[PDB]
Amino acid sequence: MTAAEHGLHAPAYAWSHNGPFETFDHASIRRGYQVYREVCAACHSLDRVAWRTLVGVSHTNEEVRNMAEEFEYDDEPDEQGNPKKRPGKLSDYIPGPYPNEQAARAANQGALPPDLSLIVKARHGGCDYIFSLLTGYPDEPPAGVALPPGSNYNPYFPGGSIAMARVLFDDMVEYEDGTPATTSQMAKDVTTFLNWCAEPEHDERKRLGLKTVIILSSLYLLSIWVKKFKWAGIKTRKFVFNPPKP
Amino acid sequence: GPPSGKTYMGWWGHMGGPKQKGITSYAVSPYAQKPLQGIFHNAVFNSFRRFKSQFLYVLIPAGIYWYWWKNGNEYNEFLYSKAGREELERVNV
Amino acid sequence: VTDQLEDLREHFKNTEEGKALVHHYEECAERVKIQQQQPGYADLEHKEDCVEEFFHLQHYLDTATAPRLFDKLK
Amino acid sequence: SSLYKTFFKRNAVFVGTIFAGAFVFQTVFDTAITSWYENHNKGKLWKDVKARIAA
Amino acid sequence: MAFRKSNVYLSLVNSYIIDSPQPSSINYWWNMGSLLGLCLVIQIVTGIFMAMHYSSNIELAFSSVEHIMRDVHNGYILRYLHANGASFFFMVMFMHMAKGLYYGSYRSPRVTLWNVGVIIFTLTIATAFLGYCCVYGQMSHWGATVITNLFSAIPFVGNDIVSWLWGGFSVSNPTIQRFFALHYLVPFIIAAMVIMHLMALHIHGSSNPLGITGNLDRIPMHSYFIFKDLVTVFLFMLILALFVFYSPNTLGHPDNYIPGNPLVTPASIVPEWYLLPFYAILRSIPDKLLGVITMFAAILVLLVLPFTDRSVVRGNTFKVLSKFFFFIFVFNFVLLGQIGACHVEVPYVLMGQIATFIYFAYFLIIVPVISTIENVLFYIGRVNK
Ligand code: HEM
Ligand code: HEM
Ligand code: HEM
Ligand SMILES: COc1c(O)c(C)c(C/C=C(\C)CC/C=C(\C)CC/C=C(/C)CC/C=C(\C)CC/C=C(\C)CCC=C(C)C)c(O)c1OC
Numbered sequence: 001m002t003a004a005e006h007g008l009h010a011p012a013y014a015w016s017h018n019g020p021f022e023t024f025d026h027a028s029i030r031r032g033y034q035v036y037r038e039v040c041a042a043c044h045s046l047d048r049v050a051w052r053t054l055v056g057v058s059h060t061n062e063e064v065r066n067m068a069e070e071f072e073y074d075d076e077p078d079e080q081g082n083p084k085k086r087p088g089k090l091s092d093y094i095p096g097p098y099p100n101e102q103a104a105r106a107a108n109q110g111a112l113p114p115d116l117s118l119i120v121k122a123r124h125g126g127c128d129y130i131f132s133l134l135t136g137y138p139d140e141p142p143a144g145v146a147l148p149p150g151s152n153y154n155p156y157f158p159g160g161s162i163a164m165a166r167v168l169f170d171d172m173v174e175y176e177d178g179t180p181a182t183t184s185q186m187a188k189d190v191t192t193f194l195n196w197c198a199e200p201e202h203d204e205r206k207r208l209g210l211k212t213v214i215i216l217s218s219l220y221l222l223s224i225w226v227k228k229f230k231w232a233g234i235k236t237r238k239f240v241f242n243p244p245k246p
Numbered sequence: 247g248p249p250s251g252k253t254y255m256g257w258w259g260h261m262g263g264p265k266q267k268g269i270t271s272y273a274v275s276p277y278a279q280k281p282l283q284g285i286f287h288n289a290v291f292n293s294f295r296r297f298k299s300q301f302l303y304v305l306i307p308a309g310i311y312w313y314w315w316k317n318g319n320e321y322n323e324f325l326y327s328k329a330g331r332e333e334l335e336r337v338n339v
Numbered sequence: 340v341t342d343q344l345e346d347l348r349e350h351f352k353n354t355e356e357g358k359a360l361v362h363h364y365e366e367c368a369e370r371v372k373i374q375q376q377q378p379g380y381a382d383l384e385h386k387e388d389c390v391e392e393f394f395h396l397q398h399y400l401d402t403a404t405a406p407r408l409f410d411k412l413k
Numbered sequence: 414s415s416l417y418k419t420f421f422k423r424n425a426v427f428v429g430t431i432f433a434g435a436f437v438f439q440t441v442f443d444t445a446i447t448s449w450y451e452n453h454n455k456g457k458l459w460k461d462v463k464a465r466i467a468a
Numbered sequence: 469m470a471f472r473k474s475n476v477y478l479s480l481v482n483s484y485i486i487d488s489p490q491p492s493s494i495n496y497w498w499n500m501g502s503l504l505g506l507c508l509v510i511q512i513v514t515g516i517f518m519a520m521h522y523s524s525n526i527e528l529a530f531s532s533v534e535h536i537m538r539d540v541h542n543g544y545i546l547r548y549l550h551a552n553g554a555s556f557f558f559m560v561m562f563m564h565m566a567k568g569l570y571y572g573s574y575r576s577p578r579v580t581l582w583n584v585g586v587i588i589f590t591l592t593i594a595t596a597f598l599g600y601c602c603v604y605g606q607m608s609h610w611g612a613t614v615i616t617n618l619f620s621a622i623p624f625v626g627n628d629i630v631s632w633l634w635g636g637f638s639v640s641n642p643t644i645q646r647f648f649a650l651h652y653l654v655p656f657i658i659a660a661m662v663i664m665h666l667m668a669l670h671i672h673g674s675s676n677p678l679g680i681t682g683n684l685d686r687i688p689m690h691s692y693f694i695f696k697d698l699v700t701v702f703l704f705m706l707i708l709a710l711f712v713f714y715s716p717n718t719l720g721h722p723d724n725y726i727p728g729n730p731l732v733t734p735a736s737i738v739p740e741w742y743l744l745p746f747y748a749i750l751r752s753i754p755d756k757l758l759g760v761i762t763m764f765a766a767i768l769v770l771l772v773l774p775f776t777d778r779s780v781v782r783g784n785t786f787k788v789l790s791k792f793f794f795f796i797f798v799f800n801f802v803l804l805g806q807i808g809a810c811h812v813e814v815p816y817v818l819m820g821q822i823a824t825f826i827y828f829a830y831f832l833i834i835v836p837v838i839s840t841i842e843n844v845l846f847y848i849g850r851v852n853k
C-alpha cells in the first residue's frame with residue numbers, strides 16, 4: 001500500500017518509562033494534566049478517568065477536591081421531586097466538553113474528537129505515535145497534495161488528512177513548576193499523562209512483575225536440578241546381553 | 247468386573263512385551279552419584295550434536311520460505327512506490 | 340526559549356545527507372508547480388505529488404532527532 | 414556441605430519449616446524489592462514530586 | 469494392596485498419574501499435554517473471577533472490562549492472564565499437534581485419540597472467538613459479524629441461521645449476551661472432551677520418539693515425569709509472566725481498545741494471530757461458498773492422515789524425505805499466517821493461493837507418495853535379490 005495511505009512510521013523516543021524497571025515520571029504526569037485541561041479538554045473527553053485516581057499520582061487529595069468542585073453534576077431530586085445540581089466530588093469522573101455526539105460533531109466541522117482515556121493503547125505506536133502526531137504538523141503540505149477544505153496535513157496520520165489542526169504552540173501554557181512550555185515539551189507531557197490514563201497500573205504492574213519473574217526463574221533453575229537428580233539412576237543405567245543357550 | 251477389550255499395553259507384570267531373557271541391567275543410586283556439576287568438560291562438546299544432524303532439515307525449508315517471503319515483500323514495496331506505479335497498473339487488475 | 344525539536348530538525352536539514360534530501364524534495368516540488376500552471380491540470384487523473392520525497396526527508400530527520408530530543412527535555 | 418547437616422542433619426526439610434520460612438520470605442523479599450525499585454526510580458516518584466511542592 | 473490402589477477414587481489417580489507405565493525414552497515434546505491441562509485451568513479460574521465483575525449487555529460490556537482493568541483489585545492481572553493465556557493455549561496446542569504429526573501419533577492404534585483431539589481443537593477455536601466478542605471492542609463486533617456470516621454460505625437456510633444466531637437484524641445486545649453465556653459453557657464441554665481424550669490415551673499409552681514399542685522398558689509416571697513436567701510448567705509460567713507483566717498487549721489488537729461501532733469497520737481490521745493461517749486460506753478463494761468450505765476443510769483434512777500415511781514405520785525420526793517435507797509444511801503454515809496479516813495485494817494473493825495448495829497437497833499427495841517411496845527405499849537398500 002502507498003506510504004501516504006499507511007502513514008509515516010513514528011520513530012522511537014527515549015521515554016523515561018520505557019524499560020522493565022522504569023516507573024512513570026510523575027512530574028511529567030502532573031504537567032500533562034495541565035496541558036490537557038488548558039488545551040485538549042476543549043474538544044476531548046476523558047470519560048474513564050475518575051478524580052480520585054489523580055490523588056497520590058500527580059496531585060494531592062486537596063488539589064483534586066478543588067478541581068472536582070469547579071464542575072457541576074446532576075444530584076438526586078429534592079423532597080418535592082424537582083431536579084437539582086451539585087458540585088463535583090472525588091467519586092465522579094472527569095466531565096467532557098460535549099453533552100452528546102451530535103454536539104461534538106457540530107463543533108468540529110462534523111468530525112468526532114475521540115475520548116483519550118485509552119488513546120495510547122488504541123493506536124499502533126503508542127506514545128511515539130501520539131507525540132509524533134502532535135509535533136508533526138508541517139507549516140505547508142508537500143507539493144501536489146490536494147488537501148480538502150477544513151482538513152489538515154500530518155504525515156503520521158494514515159492518509160495524511162486529519163480533521164484536527166495543530167493546537168500546540170510555544171509558551172501557550174504557563175507551567176506551575178517553571179518548566180519552559182515548548183511545544184515538544186508539552187507534547188511529551190500530555191502523552192505521558194495519557195499513557196497513565198490508559199495504564200494506571202503501570203508502576204505497580206512492573207514492580208509485581210519483578211518479584212514474579214525472580215521467583216519463577218529460581219523455581220525453573222531449581223526444578224532442572226531436582227529433575228536431573230531424580231533421573232540420575234535411569235540416565236546412567238547400563239545393560240549387558242548374554243545370549244541364552246537353547 | 248465387565249470384560250475389557252484387548253489392547254497393545256498391559257500393566258506392571260503383564261506389559262504385553264515379548265519374554266525377556268539374557269538381559270541384565272545395573273544402576274547406581276542418585277544419592278551415591280556426583281552432585282550435578284559434572285555436566286561440563288565431559289558433557290559439553292558431546293552436546294549440540296543432536297542438532298548438527300537436524301539443522302539442515304530445518305534450515306533449508308526455512309531458507310526457501312524466508313527468501314520467498316522477502317522477495318514478495320520487496321516486490322510489493324516497489325509496486326507501491328512512484329517508480330513502480332506503471333508496473334502496478336499492469337499487474338493489478 | 341525556542342522549541343527543542345524544531346532546533347534539532349533545522350540542524351539536521353543542514354547536514355550533507357539532509358541537504359541532499361531537501362534537494363530531491365525540492366526538485367520534485369519544482370516539477371509539480373510547473374504541471375499545475377499548464378492547461379488541463381484539473382482533468383489529468385495522473386497528478387504527481389511529492390509525499391514520497393517528503394517522507395524520505397522526514398524519515399531521515401526522525402532517525403536523527405528521535406534518540407536525542409529527550410535529553411534536551413525535562 | 415556441612416552447613417546443611419547442622420540445621421537439618423541428613424534429613425529433608427519438613428513442611429512445617431517450609432511453610433514457616435515461606436511467611437518470612439514473603440515479607441523480607443517484598444521490602445527488598447520495593448526498596449530497590451523506589452530507589453532505582455528516585456526523582457520520578459510522587460513522593461519525590463510532593464517534596465518539591467508546597468501548598 | 470496399597471490404599472492408592474484399593475480406593476475407588478484414588479485408584480483413578482494412581483492409574484493415570486502415579487503408576488502409569490511410561491516409555492522410558494519420551495522427550496520434552498511429550499510435556500505439552502500437561503501444559504494444555506494447565507492452560508485449561510488458568511482460563512477457567514481467571515474467567516470465573518472476572519465473570520463476577522462482567523456485564524454482558526452491549527451497552528456495558530466494554531466498560532465492564534475497563535472496570536475490571538481499573539477498579540477490581542488485581543483485575544488487570546486477571547484480564548491480562550486470561551487474554552495472554554488464550555494465546556499461550558494456542559501456541560502449546562500447535563506444538564502438541566505438530567509433535568503428533570512428526571511422531572506418527574495419529575496412527576493406529578491411536579486414531580480415536582487423534583480424532584478426539586481434532587474435536588477439542590475446533591471447540592477451543594470456537595471458545596476463544598466467543599470470548600473475544602465479549603470485550604465488545606471494534607475487533608469484537610466485526611469478528612462476530614464476519615464469523616456468524618460464515619453460515620450464510622449455506623444454501624437456502626443460511627441467512628435464517630444467521631438471524632437466529634444474532635437474535636435479530638444484526639450483531640446486537642441479544643448476540644453479545646448469548647455469546648457470553650456460550651463462552652462460559654464450552655470450556656466445560658472441552659473439559660469433558662479432555663477426559664475422553666485421556667481415556668483413549670490410557671488404553672494404549674503414549675508413543676515414543678523411536679516410533680516402536682515401549683512395552684520392554686517402562687518407568688512409573690510418579691516421580692520421573694511428575695518432576696520432569698514441573699520443569700516445563702515453570703518455564704511456561706516464567707514466559708507467560710514476562711508477557712502479562714511486561715508486554716500485556718503485544719499479542720492483541722489496538723482496535724479492541726475502541727468500543728464497537730456498527731457503522732464503521734476499521735481499515736486496520738486483522739484477525740487474532742492464531743486464526744491467521746485459516747483466514748489466509750479462506751481469503752485465497754475468490755468465491756464466498758468455496759472460501760468457507762475450503763477453510764473448514766483445512767481443519768477436517770487432519771482426519772485423513774491415518775489413511776494417507778502409507779509408511780510401515782511410525783514417525784519421522786528415521787525418515788530423511790519425511791523430515792524435510794514436514795518442515796516444509798511447518799514453515800508453509802507460518803507463511804499462511806504472515807499472508808493473513810498482509811493486505812490483499814498482488815504478490816501476496818498469489819503466494820497465499822500457492823501456500824494453500826501446498827497445505828492440502830501435504831496430506832493428500834506428498835505424504836502418501838513420499839511414504840511409499842521411503843517404504844521401497846528401505847527394502848531395496850538391504851535385500852540382495
Ligand atoms: C494537546 C491537546 C490534544 C491532544 C493530546 C489531542 C490528541 C488527539 C489524538 C491522539 C487524536 C486521535 C487521532 C487518531 O485517530 O489517530 C485526536 C483527534 C482529534 N482531535 Fe485532538 N488533541 C488535542 C487537542 C485538540 C483540540 C483542542 C481539538 C478541538 C479544536 C481537537 C480536535 C480533534 C479532532 C476533531 C480530532 C479528529 C481527527 C480525525 O478524525 O481526523 N483536539 N486528537
Ligand atoms: C479454554 C477456555 C477459555 C478460553 C480459550 C478463553 C478465551 C478468551 C478470550 C480470547 C477472551 C478475550 C480476551 C481479551 O480480552 O482480549 C476471553 C474473554 C473473557 N472470558 Fe474467556 N476463555 C476461556 C474460558 C472462560 C471461562 C470458563 C469463563 C468463565 C466465565 C470466561 C470468561 C471470560 C470473560 C468474563 C471474558 C471478558 C474479559 C476479558 O476480555 O478478558 N472465559 N476469553
Ligand atoms: C485441551 C487440549 C488437550 C489436552 C489437555 C491434551 C492432553 C494430552 C495429554 C496429557 C497427552 C499425553 C502427553 C503428551 O503426549 O503430550 C496427550 C497425548 C496426545 N494428544 Fe492431546 N491434548 C489436547 C489436545 C489435542 C489435540 C488438539 C490433538 C490433535 C489434533 C491431540 C492429540 C494427541 C495425541 C495424538 C496424543 C498421543 C501422543 C503420543 O503418545 O505420541 N491432543 N494429549
Ligand atoms: C500416558 O500419558 C500421560 C498421562 O496419562 C497423564 C495423566 C499425564 C499428566 C497430565 C494430566 C493428567 C493433565 C490433566 C488435566 C485435566 C484433566 C484438566 C481438566 C480441567 C479442569 C478445568 C478441571 C475443573 C476445575 C474446576 C471446577 C475448578 C475451577 C473453579 C474454582 C476453584 C472455584 C472458584 C470460586 C470461588 C468462590 C472460590 C501425562 O503427562 C502423560 O504423559 C507424559
Ligand SMILES: C/C=C(C)/C=C/C=C/C(OC)[C@@H](C)[C@H](OC)[C@@H](C)CCc1oc2c(O)c(OC)cc(OC)c2c(=O)c1C
Nearest residue numbers: 590593594597607610611614616738739740743746747750
Ligand atoms: C455460537 C458459535 C458460533 C456462531 C461460531 C463458532 C464457530 C466458528 C469458527 O470455528 C469454530 C471460526 C472461529 C473459524 O473457524 C473456521 C475461524 C478460523 C475464524 C477465522 C476468521 O476469523 C476472523 C476474525 O477473527 C476477525 O476478527 C477481526 C475478522 C475476520 O474477517 C476479517 C475473520 C475471518 O474472516 C476468518 C475467516
Ligand SMILES: CCCCCCCCCCCO[C@@H]1O[C@H](CO)[C@@H](O[C@H]2O[C@H](CO)[C@@H](O)[C@H](O)[C@H]2O)[C@H](O)[C@H]1O
Nearest residue numbers: 277421422423424425426427428429430431432433435
Ligand atoms: C500446590 C501448592 C504447593 C504447596 C507446597 C508444596 C509442597 C511442599 C512440601 C514441603 C516438605 O514436605 C516434606 O518433604 C520431605 C521430602 O522432601 C519429607 O521428608 C521425608 O522424606 C525425606 C526424603 O526421603 C526424609 O529424609 C525425611 O526424613 C522424611 O521425613 C518431609 O517429611 C515432608 O514434610
